[PDB]
Amino acid sequence: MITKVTARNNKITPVELLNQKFGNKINLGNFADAVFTDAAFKNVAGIANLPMKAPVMQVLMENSIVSKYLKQFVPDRSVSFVEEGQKFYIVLEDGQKIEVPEDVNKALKATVSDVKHWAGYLTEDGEHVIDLLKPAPGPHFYVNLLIGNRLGFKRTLQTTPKSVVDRFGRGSFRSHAATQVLATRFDMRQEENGFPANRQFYLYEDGKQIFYSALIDDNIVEATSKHSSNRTVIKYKTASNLEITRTIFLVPHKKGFPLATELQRIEIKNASDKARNLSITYTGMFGTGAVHAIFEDVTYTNVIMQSAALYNDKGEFIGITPDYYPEEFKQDTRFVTMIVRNGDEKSFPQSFSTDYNDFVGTGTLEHPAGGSNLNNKLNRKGPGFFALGAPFTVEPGKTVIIDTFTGLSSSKDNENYSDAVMLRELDNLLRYFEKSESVEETLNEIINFHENYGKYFQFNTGNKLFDSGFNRNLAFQVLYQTFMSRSFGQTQKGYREIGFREIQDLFASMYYFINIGYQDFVKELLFEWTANVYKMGYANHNFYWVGKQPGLYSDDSLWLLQAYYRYIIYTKDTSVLNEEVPVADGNNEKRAVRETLKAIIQYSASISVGDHGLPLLDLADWNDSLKIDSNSIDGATKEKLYYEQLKKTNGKYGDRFMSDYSESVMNAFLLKLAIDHLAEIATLDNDTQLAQQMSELSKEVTDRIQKHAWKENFFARVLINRYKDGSYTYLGAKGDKLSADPNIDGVYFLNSFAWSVLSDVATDEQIAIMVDVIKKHLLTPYGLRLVTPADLNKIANDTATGHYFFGDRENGAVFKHASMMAVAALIKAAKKVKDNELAKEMARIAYFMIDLVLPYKNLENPFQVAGNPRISTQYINTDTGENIGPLLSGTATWLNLNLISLAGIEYTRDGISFNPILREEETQLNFTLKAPKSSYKFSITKPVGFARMESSEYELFVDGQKIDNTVIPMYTDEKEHIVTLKFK
Amino acid sequence: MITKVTARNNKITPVELLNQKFGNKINLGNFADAVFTDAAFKNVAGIANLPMKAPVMQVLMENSIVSKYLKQFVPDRSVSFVEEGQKFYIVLEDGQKIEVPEDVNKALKATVSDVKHWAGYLTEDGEHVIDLLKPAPGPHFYVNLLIGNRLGFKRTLQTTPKSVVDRFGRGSFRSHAATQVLATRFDMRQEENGFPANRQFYLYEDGKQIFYSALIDDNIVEATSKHSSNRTVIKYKTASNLEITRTIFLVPHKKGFPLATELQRIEIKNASDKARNLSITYTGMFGTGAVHAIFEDVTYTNVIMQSAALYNDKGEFIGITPDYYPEEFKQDTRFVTMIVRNGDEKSFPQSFSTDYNDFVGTGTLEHPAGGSNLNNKLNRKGPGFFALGAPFTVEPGKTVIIDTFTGLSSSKDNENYSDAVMLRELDNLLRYFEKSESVEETLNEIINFHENYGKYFQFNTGNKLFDSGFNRNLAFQVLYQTFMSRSFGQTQKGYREIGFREIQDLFASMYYFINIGYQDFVKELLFEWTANVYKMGYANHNFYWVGKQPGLYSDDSLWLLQAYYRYIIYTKDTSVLNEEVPVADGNNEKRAVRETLKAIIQYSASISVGDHGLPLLDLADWNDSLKIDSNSIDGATKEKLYYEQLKKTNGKYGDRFMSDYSESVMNAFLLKLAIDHLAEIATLDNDTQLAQQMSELSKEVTDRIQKHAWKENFFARVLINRYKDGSYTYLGAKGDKLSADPNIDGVYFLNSFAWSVLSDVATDEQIAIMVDVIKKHLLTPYGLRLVTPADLNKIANDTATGHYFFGDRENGAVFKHASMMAVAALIKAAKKVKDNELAKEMARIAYFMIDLVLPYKNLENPFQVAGNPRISTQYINTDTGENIGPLLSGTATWLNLNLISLAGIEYTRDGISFNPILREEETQLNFTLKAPKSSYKFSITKPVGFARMESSEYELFVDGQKIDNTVIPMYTDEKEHIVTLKFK
Ligand SMILES: OC[C@H]1O[C@@H](O[C@H]2[C@H](O)[C@@H](O)[C@H](O[C@H]3[C@H](O)[C@@H](O)[C@H](O)O[C@@H]3CO)O[C@@H]2CO)[C@H](O)[C@@H](O)[C@@H]1O
Ligand SMILES: OC[C@H]1O[C@@H](O[C@H]2[C@H](O)[C@@H](O)[C@H](O[C@H]3[C@H](O)[C@@H](O)[C@H](O)O[C@@H]3CO)O[C@@H]2CO)[C@H](O)[C@@H](O)[C@@H]1O
Ligand SMILES: [Cl-]
Ligand SMILES: [Cl-]
Ligand SMILES: [Cl-]
Ligand SMILES: [Cl-]
Ligand SMILES: [Cl-]
């Protein structure tokens, strides 16, 4: 009877039908655009020969002239526009080619003129300049992320403020945890991160609205946004020649300031020849303290608060705070205030409103009926809407500056807390920013801070999009993730705690912090993670103010050894091993770091091991889909059962916990690497007993992995111990019986390869075999997928049926973080394997995958690949090529590590092991490197083709002297050293 | 330094300052309005002599002419408008009185002309006619609630669809449980129940937007909404003489239909002399199946679905369905479709869009840039936005009708479910509604159904607002609550299950259902609740598809005896006692209803009792604030401990569970009443042993209550057993030591009074004493508060600090449900106490409180009292007098019972015990009453003053014969009986 046609099973696309109908009467070029003319998809209207994919038909249909013209033909007749000799025609299927009227021609020419820049462009410094009218490639593309600075202050991870800002300034602003200053929105669209009023304002003249910052109409003749490092600047010009500029940034902390302040400076320049009598109404919505009640009891959120007015020492109104009745919502205190600077005069708002209904009245948010006559009524209820009003006359050629300060004070940074604390901190803030120039000086301080931070590693290549993308944008993102982990963004809006394994972000950022004088901060972070390890050696899976989920995931603790290794090898500071740090078990017990690292290794190498002596998988490891064991236990439960086991079987602590639980081969690799790291740390610390014990244990673990986890053509991913008849014994290689793809024998996990190499277990022949499998079955046109198709229902009855269409997340996506771990392995192997042809191939795959993750390349074909050209995104949809959010992800961290690795830098016992792997087409690579007490200029030259030190002739010079030792010293002479490498 | 002034701490109001500055130069009358002119509140602009409180200054300030005129004086000078001799002046503080210009005079006159009706008015049939421009008193005031009809089909409570509709048609639409058809919004404002596009549409002409159903601009010359019983009709007239009418209702179920369908009919009449070529774009937003992910993972909500197009047998597009990948979201299937009826022609949509971003484009939702050129693109992702487009030419004087059908099919009503089921049900629906007249016939069927349902009890007084308010509006609300409990509304948006104690709704509705032939449905509901009682006698606190929270709250089971009593006494159907009903414990065990009722009584009378033999309080009872015992246990835990106790101490089942837990006196009253009810049921069932046992137990329980719970001047509320030194021993009367008000000795709970009377425990002297306490300490200007101020931290030695400002919810509100239980007691006592002066006073309090809850009276002073003039609201804020939502509440149920009781109707063993209690100023009361096999016309006459049968002379006649027996027979002769009562 009735039939259903889904988006995906729709049989033909508009552009395909356009080609079918017109592809032999006109040249459709390499790119075209088209729309179906009716809901049965029988006819199309399109346009030929575009420079890239873009929604041109949509923009044309918004044009009254072209839309009316098309109605002469559509829907009954298909049509294509075509340009010949710089004039436009419309072509019909019956052959006719009609020269379109002049007004249609002008509209078509204007529309196609700059299609290649419709998603914006990057400045030389890597800043994204966006047109406020153009369509968005996707909901993360036009987004900037802002952060405060709590370095030098307490609990930096938990207290640094953070904000998200789209091209219109939309978004939200948080203090500690998920505490909302400006309101988040949890609604249907990814595009709506915040309440729509946030950061927006109106201008009035003669009682009539002339401007709204989130409405572009015909009275706006220019409107652009620029996303830069830690600030966004939005500019408009009206037809009446008002020039409006918004600058948004977070205030770096200073003693006595509120815990969170966001500054928005608005500059209004009268570029006309007549004075104008204007007024501003600045609006927003405070976040509720009662977030769960938005879902559960909206009336509660309203009745528990009221608005309150703030007055300075002269009795002048300065702004609004939402005042709460319940004590639990009085431990933070929000505020908004504004200063109007008009020539000599400084003024504060003359009126306000605090009730959204009274403000909008009979109008809309874009055209509010009460916006020009604020009612000065303090709302007895929430929500905490605010509007602040002030008049100003602006003379010809002159500018008025309005500085807004939005923020929160908190008990999280102040003992004996009450709203009196907020009032004092707000006074301190406003006094600091009393002089107009103070805002500019703070912005310059922010700019200079991030510029200085980035100097640890600077590329200088022929490609300024790459150089700025790495030197500024990626460096900023890695700082951002060190402070924020995975806890905030455009679509990351729920409360998220810090995952233990996300210590990974510090793997990349620690060098940057050390080289701006914050080595102690790095140590503090190491110790903070260490305090989340239990005596037995498992870890809290998550923490924020305190830790939770003891030993729930089996991989967590092992990552901490990589962090300590990187820190100790770089700095040679073994003193951290003697630090007495609280154990996660509490009471009031502390343990030296060295003993905690030993315990981590013992847990995974000896206690929590399965029948093959490899680490147990438990609930899951790094991969949350490996819910193979449905009766798994956490570390606290395991600890209790273990002690009962020792008592019942007369065992000794350190003996194996006996079970038929499955084993994680990825954890085995993480462990082997961790053991190697501790052996090397111990040697540096002159701890001969520990070095020897760890060296021998590494050999033993390596033997277990080789004997029990190499399965013909790959390292397995999981060993299965509960089927004593052999029905299933492993997952992750040929013969595992678990493939869901009839054309693939076995399931293959990218991380089995990656971690077998990163841990230095895989032999050269094993690498060659695995790379062959990867090329055949894991390498897609959009990069390296995480795993091939698996049918885990055969062993994990528990198993979730799928949630995703093909291409998204677990149904076949390219997870870019995992792809970057695999690239790290490809790079490491390409430097060392004996066979130069294997090395060359692995480096080709490495650069192919890097090219698919570099954010700036998202502007090459933005309406297909989307993403964000300054900030990583999490995955590539393998059906469409679209880069899909969220923004914060391990991709950025590992991309940073990988590009530095390819440039040749690895820190080792005796200095910098230098071994660069350039692109085949590159003939030069230059970069600078900072160290704590010296600096370096590196220059590499080669002919076209694959070159590497292992197999190619070369000459290496340091400070003008030819040298054979490729381990460059870590100099401490406070001089710049010149390193030159020439491949012959 | 900086100071803070809250809404509540603000010293003086605008109107107070207006009177201070002007009150003896002009007559400000009984009502005025004013606004502060600046943020320091020094000056005011106001207007004198309004007919009621209303936001007149706000509306005047939206008027460009008046706003500009005021700027000649404000902000520096205070002003008041005044009308004298039908012309307006503005008065200044210096005494100047200036005749305002003619254009300002016209604007002021027009604005004040109809202030008395700014919040709308009620038709004679109780329908609320609302102006779409006027401000709202509050966020529940302009709301209607719609319901489907699943009578005669399975799982009626769980499957009846329901919708909320404001005056603009905003809101949302649900199927079973919290399953969203059209999307709910969980955001900052109580006003936003749904995604803003829901139910809204646009009209176009020559490619330009001429109308949006949720935008009133100057091209709209009339715009009104009418909320009636189970439908809303919204009407507009454009300046171009288009007349647009929207009619929204839910389709009653028919076999083969989808489980939920909402019909919106749009009629467009061309009342001009020229044909118009128009088009409509009909929009909305499907709700997500993944509601939790709106908060947790918005990207997930998008990627798990895609849009899909629907086609009829002829290959014509008919509408859209959102298609889901995960199996858990494929068990419901949503749809939207539309039919355009233009003269002889019927047509389906010619175009669609399914991507909000493409639809809005560079515009706004009110003015979407893609609305006139839908792109016919099926979105690969959610959210499930839809727009359906169709053209039509409408000739002069003619009408085009667009019928939209939005809905969902579900596995909850169909075995072997898939989307094929939806397609078949949608086909059935569209075939049924093929002919234009079918929509009108279905609407008339709905209207007639509710009119017939209401005939159980009809008032005929001189007061059509009261008569329609009761006969139509309250009757509908009580039906609504029987099907929906407390689970849906404007601000009730989270998932809520059916509370066991909300069987109370059936106390009022059962008589209505029985008198339309649905006695079997009433029995089925009795059995459904009965299946949520455990063998031991405690109950699941909540249920929906299954029950949960076994015995968590101590009162729950006792309410079931009231439902069985009302049913059995009305119908004399004792057969229900023999029904074998599943026990809540499961394991396929059943028990006869009679034995379950016995078990309920045994649990509260013998097992779960404290040191005084009164029922234990447990976590809490009816009052969720009585968290007195911090180590309480649920019934499952108690059952386990009880059996352990019996074994340890060699006890027998039925012995007391031993503890120092506190006792609930309200539960003791509910129990005493329950026992009396079972004794009477048993006597009717000729079960002499059970009747004797219950009669004796009632005496025993009464003695326990009198001996241990009467405390000098009140029945206590809780007896406390854990302080053996006597430090605290009770809560709820003089001497309890728990008052938080230094001027009150004791805490007094309204329900201690109410239930002491409803259970026939309180003596006449106890009633006199308690009513004196109530008058002194519980009766406020806004009605009966629930409790006086208490300091429970002294015994719950640390429970929650308060959450509310004074006046709201637990901080002193008038909870209208509890107020109506107290009124039930006052009425019962007024009928029977010996002292006529006590009776008179109690009846005065009863009618005072009724007047404060009757919805239609919310239109007397609507901008102060708000509420909703057709639907109850939950509480009155005792600081402001505002009636605050939610809408569904026990208020409506008990208001219905109380008004019928006051009219004199109580069903007893031998018929109708007739004992009416009229208002003192009433001289007449007439009403009709339906019974299953007869009907009645009642007429009561009296002189002015208090009259009642107990104390006043009267003559009673039935069918023209004077009778002395005031128990009127329940006649079964299928005749109308005339009952006349004349007080002398
Ligand atoms: O519905 C039962 C009772 O509700 C009480 O209001 C409660 C709110 O509904 C509830 O949301 C809130 O609980 C949280 C809130 O959800 C969360 O956002 C915030 O972080 O903490 C709040 C702490 O409670 O609690 C209140 C009060 O308990 C009504 O007061 C009551 O009438 C009603 O029976
Ligand atoms: O965050 C860890 C993993 O998340 C996975 O997506 C999950 C969604 O975030 C989660 O919302 C969903 O769970 C619910 C959903 O919350 C609720 O609305 C609905 O009723 O049921 C959903 C069923 O689960 O689950 C998915 C995963 O199943 C990512 O897939 C994964 O990459 C990530 O590690
Ligand atoms: Cl171009
Ligand atoms: Cl994000
Ligand atoms: Cl993995
Ligand atoms: Cl509600
Ligand atoms: Cl109570």
Side-chain angles (χ1 to χ4, degrees), chain B residues 621-623 626 666 717 749-752 786:
Chain B
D621 58 13
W622 175 97
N623 187 329
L626 293 180
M666 178 177 174
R717 185 62 178 74
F749 288 78
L750 193 67
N751 271 324
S752 285
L786 179 71

Coordinates of all heavy atoms in Angstrom, one line a residue, chain B residues 621-623 626 666 717 749-752 786, ligand 7:
Chain B
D621 N 5.1 9.0 54.3 CA 3.7 8.6 54.0 C 3.2 9.5 52.9 O 3.9 9.8 52.0 CB 2.9 8.6 55.3 CG 2.8 9.9 56.0 OD1 3.2 11.0 55.5 OD2 2.3 9.9 57.2
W622 N 1.9 9.9 53.0 CA 1.4 10.9 51.9 C 2.3 12.1 51.8 O 2.5 12.7 50.8 CB 0.0 11.3 52.3 CG -0.6 12.3 51.4 CD1 -1.4 12.1 50.3 CD2 -0.5 13.7 51.5 NE1 -1.8 13.3 49.7 CE2 -1.2 14.3 50.4 CE3 0.2 14.6 52.4 CZ2 -1.3 15.7 50.2 CZ3 0.2 15.9 52.2 CH2 -0.6 16.5 51.1
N623 N 2.9 12.6 53.0 CA 3.7 13.8 53.0 C 5.2 13.4 52.8 O 5.8 12.8 53.7 CB 3.5 14.5 54.3 CG 4.1 15.8 54.4 OD1 5.2 16.0 53.8 ND2 3.6 16.7 55.2
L626 N 8.1 14.3 55.5 CA 8.3 13.7 56.8 C 9.3 12.6 56.7 O 9.1 11.4 57.1 CB 6.9 13.1 57.2 CG 5.9 14.2 57.5 CD1 4.6 13.5 58.0 CD2 6.4 15.2 58.6
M666 N -1.5 10.1 60.3 CA -2.3 10.2 59.2 C -2.6 8.8 58.6 O -3.7 8.4 58.3 CB -1.8 11.1 58.1 CG -2.6 11.1 56.8 SD -2.0 12.2 55.6 CE -3.0 11.9 54.2
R717 N 0.7 14.3 64.3 CA 1.0 13.9 62.9 C 1.9 12.7 62.9 O 1.7 11.8 62.1 CB 1.6 15.0 62.1 CG 1.8 14.7 60.7 CD 0.5 14.4 60.0 NE 0.7 14.1 58.5 CZ 1.2 13.0 58.1 NH1 1.6 12.0 58.9 NH2 1.4 12.8 56.7
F749 N -0.6 20.1 61.5 CA -0.7 19.6 60.1 C -2.2 19.6 59.7 O -3.0 18.9 60.4 CB -0.1 18.2 60.0 CG 1.4 18.2 60.0 CD1 2.1 18.3 61.2 CD2 2.1 18.0 58.9 CE1 3.5 18.2 61.3 CE2 3.5 17.9 58.9 CZ 4.1 18.0 60.1
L750 N -2.5 20.3 58.6 CA -3.9 20.3 58.2 C -4.5 18.9 58.0 O -5.6 18.7 58.4 CB -3.9 21.0 56.8 CG -5.3 21.4 56.3 CD1 -6.0 22.5 57.2 CD2 -5.1 21.9 54.9
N751 N -3.7 17.9 57.5 CA -4.2 16.6 57.3 C -4.5 15.8 58.6 O -5.2 14.9 58.6 CB -3.2 15.8 56.5 CG -3.4 15.9 55.0 OD1 -4.5 16.0 54.5 ND2 -2.3 15.9 54.3
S752 N -3.9 16.2 59.7 CA -4.2 15.6 61.0 C -5.7 15.9 61.3 O -6.5 15.0 61.7 CB -3.4 16.1 62.2 OG -2.1 15.5 62.2
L786 N -0.6 23.9 54.5 CA -0.5 22.5 54.8 C -0.1 22.2 56.2 O -0.5 21.2 56.9 CB 0.5 21.9 53.8 CG 0.8 20.4 54.0 CD1 -0.5 19.6 53.5 CD2 2.0 20.0 53.1
Ligands
CL7 CL 0.5 15.9 55.9

